[PDB]
Each structure stands twice: as C-alpha cells, then as structure tokens.
Design a protein around this ligand. Sequence first.
Ligand SMILES: O=C(NCc1cccc(-n2ncc(C(=O)Nc3ccc4nc[nH]c(=O)c4c3)c2O)c1)Nc1ccccc1
Ligand SMILES: [Ca+2]
Ligand SMILES: [Cl-]
Lengths: 247, 57
Amino acid sequence: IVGGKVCPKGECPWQVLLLVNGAQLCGGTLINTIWVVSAAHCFDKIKNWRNLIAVLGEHDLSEHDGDEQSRRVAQVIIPSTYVPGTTNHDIALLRLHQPVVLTDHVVPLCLPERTFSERTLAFVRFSLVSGWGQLLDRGATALELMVLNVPRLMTQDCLQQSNITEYMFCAGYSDGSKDSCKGDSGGPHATHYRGTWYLTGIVSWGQGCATVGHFGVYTRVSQYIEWLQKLMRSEPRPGVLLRAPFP
Amino acid sequence: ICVNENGGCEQYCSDHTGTKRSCRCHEGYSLLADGVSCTPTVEYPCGKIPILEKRNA
Ligand SMILES: O=C(NCc1cccc(-n2ncc(C(=O)Nc3ccc4nc[nH]c(=O)c4c3)c2O)c1)Nc1ccccc1
Ligand SMILES: [Ca+2]
Ligand SMILES: [Cl-]
C-alpha cells in the first residue's frame, strides 16, 4: 500500500496473509470461517500446492502475539474464464483445511447480495484497501498491515481520466501518491454501508503500482456472488486446484 | 423500490408484485419490527469490527 497508514491492530480483522513456503505470496479476505477470497493470479506459478498457508489475525509480521491463526489451504477454486498472467476474472475462492475461530481479531467481511452490491454499494464513493505490500513502487514491503481510503470511478470516467471490462472497476488516484501495490494483490476492497462492511473488490493488477496517469484495477466482486455462493454449497474435490465453470 | 435509497433497508432488499418490498439481513443478523433494521444475533457478525463496537458499547 502506497500513501496509506497502519491499520490499527484488529481494525482490519478480515485481512488474510497468504504464504508459500513461509514467504509472503498475496493478501486475501475472510468471508466465513472456512472461506477466503483472493486473486487468481496469485496462484499462476504454484508448483507444490500443499505448501500454501493462510494466516488470520496477523498484524505485525516481525512478532508473534498469539492472535494469529494459520490454516492449510485445502482447495483453490478459479473461474474457467481466467487466463494465467492476465487481469480479467482475477478471483479465487480458497477453502481452509479447518475453520478459523472467530475472535476480536478474526472476523469475516460480509459477502453482499448481487442486487445490493450493484444498486447501493457500487455508488459508495470511498472504500478501504489493505495489505502488507510494497510501501513504494520498487520499494520494501510493509511489516505492519497498511490501509488506504480510495475513491471508486465509473468505468467511463476511469478511461477519460487515465482493457477495463465489466468484471473490473477502477479506484484510487492518478497522481502517483496513493495506490495499492505489488504484495497487496488478493486483498480486500471493503465498502461501508449503514454500520456494516462488505466485500466489493479484490486487489488485482494493472501495468504498475503508483503509476502516474493510472488507477488501481480491482476485480468487480458483484459479478461473482452467485458463482461464489454455489461453490460454498459444494463438496470438496480431491486435488487442491479446481477450475470451475463461469458463469 | 429497492433501487431507490436501498428501499429503506439497512442491508438486503427484494421487490414484490405490487407496491410491496421486503428487507432481509445477512446470516448472523435478525430483522427488527420496523422491517428495515438488522441487529446482530451472534458475537462476531460479519462486517463489524469488535474493538470499535465495544469502544462505543
Ligand atoms: O507470475 C504470475 N503470477 C505469480 C504472482 C504471484 C503473486 C503476485 C504476483 N505479482 N507480480 C506482480 C504483481 C503486481 O504488480 N501486483 C499489483 C498489485 C497492486 C497494484 N495496484 C495498482 N496497480 C497495479 O498495477 C498493481 C499491481 C503481482 O501481484 C505474481 N503470473 C504470470 C503468468 C504468466 C505470465 C506472467 C505472469
Ligand atoms: Ca504477528
Ligand atoms: Cl494437489
């Protein structure tokens, strides 16, 4: 996250850290005790799918304070329409091997109904994006969880103020001062409405972190609600990676 | 009705045949008698931040 602030411990309780062989891979969003939403492109180069770990309740990566909960990833589900190395349909649904325990520091973000998200949440201007990604373009990653308030653009206005499909949206700033960054992909774009927070986007990827004249590109979660809900009702299948038909 | 002002609902909204509307709440919440408000039914409902909820409790 570029140009944000530290998310005070416990104020981003749905944030997930994904690790491969102990190393930072990507962010994610808890939506229930066993389900995490992330970005498909995080898994393009995974060789050993059994070394993937999800961590909840994380804040400061330099220390262990006892609020962290680590789980193995039992399933990674990606839409059939996603092409590795690209931006369109950049979403993944992860099933944890065992549920996390909800606590003051571990709480799911609400996955909204599609109608609610399209009719109402889509017109809330500002939303929060978070992660342990790079603090600058070509810079070191953050040790404490960072958060940034970003304004959403209509796709017409993104193109004017700057391809971008109906499965994406633009949010953030074009002046290069504030943006999501490499290391934040898969993390939440969370939107507040009448006292409750909802998942509206996933940090995807564009042509560069904090690039002047360009906005952050986010997966438009509202297009995937029905797809996600059906998968969450389904039984697990052998083999971690699952490609599921979209729509 | 639901397209304007979220139909007055705090959370989810469904249109019905006629001048009819029904609000609904996410799992872990229940709908109040006003027909629009949602109140938690569990300790850790989705989309709420415990340390901030207890800070105003
Ligand atoms: O290698 C493949 N996958 C591995 C894999 C895993 C995890 C992270 C990554 N990975 N590498 C670069 C980035 C990245 O820059 N993210 C990023 C985050 C926030 C942003 N905010 C605003 N604007 C942005 O532009 C933006 C960009 C990223 O997330 C790759 N696939 C692939 C497949 C075929 C060809 C090339 C690549
Ligand atoms: Ca820690
Ligand atoms: Cl496997």
